Structure 1
Amino acid sequence: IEKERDVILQELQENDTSMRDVVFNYLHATAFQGTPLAQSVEGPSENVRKLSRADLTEYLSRHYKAPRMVLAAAGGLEHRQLLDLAQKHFSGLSGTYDEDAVPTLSPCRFTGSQICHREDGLPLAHVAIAVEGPGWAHPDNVALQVANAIIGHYDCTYGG
């Protein structure tokens, strides 16, 4: 726990240079202010320093429940083979939980905003603009994937 604590602080210093990852993390911070989605997967370096074994056992004992989870596979196997192992191994999971142990997700507050981290020392300028999206299950996701695809994408290596 203490080794990887030092490692992850070293990773953040590396991800401070991955300018792309920074923008999206800044982006979610502003679109989704005051909500969890503003957070990063990695979280602040403070919590990385101020963490405990107890915080994790809480996190694991709360979220990792069979109903919220999925086993799945693909390739040269059979479904029936997978079941005999699931019952063999995964029958032992906590398939239940207390009256209010598992949280639920409310909608999150999108907002219109801007963040402008000025750094002239660096030679190039990453930008990211976006809006509120439908969600996964909303059917108009299909039409939008076309609309983005009309615009497409580009690098300076494409020979067209």
Structure 2
Amino acid sequence: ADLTEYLSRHYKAPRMVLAAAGGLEHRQLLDLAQKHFSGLSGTYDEDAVPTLTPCRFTGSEIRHREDGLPLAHVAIAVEGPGWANPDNV
């Protein structure tokens, strides 16, 4: 039931992309997508729209002391800039 809820709430038409790359023309792809993807979705279960929340970066450390290992892994990280800003580049 939860699987069917997830399938219902996130396999929706407008959010998703069909894209092809290779030696083929756009008309063929558009017509085949018209003949097959006409009829997936477009409306939610009583408008239960999933929506992003811009979350918060905490900054902390979790250290898993486990000495019976040959090498040690460290990951250090800071804030992400985002996408559309050129600070990305």
TM-score strictly above 0.5: yes
CA–CA separation in structure 1 for the residues paired with 2:10 and 2:33: 19
Correspondence for 2:66: 119
User: Which digits, 9 at most, give the CA deviation of each residue in 1:50-93, with x for residues without a partner?
Assistant: xxxx1110001001101110000100111111111111110111
Q: Could you list the runs of 4 or more consecutive aligned residues of structure 1 that deviate by over 3 angstroms after TM superposition?
A: none
User: Which digits, 9 at most, give the CA deviation of each residue in 1:108-149, with x for residues without a partner?
Assistant: 11111001001110010011000110112222xxxxxxxxxx
Structure showing the higher helix proportion among its residues = 1
Say if 1:65 and 1:95, in contact at 8 Å, map to a contact too.
yes
CA RMSD of aligned residues (A): 1.2
CA–CA separation in structure 1 for the residues paired with 2:83 and 2:73: 27
* Unaligned residue ranges in structure 2 (runs of 5+): none
Say if 2:57 and 2:79, in contact at 8 Å, map to a contact too.
yes
Q: What is the total number of aligned residue pairs between the two structures?
A: 86
* Unaligned residue ranges in structure 1 (runs of 5+): 1-53, 140-160
Say if 1:65 and 1:94, in contact at 8 Å, map to a contact too.
yes
CA–CA separation in structure 2 for the residues paired with 1:127 and 1:86: 46
Aligned partner (choices 56, 60, 68) of residue 7 of structure 2: 60
Structure showing the higher strand proportion among its residues = 2
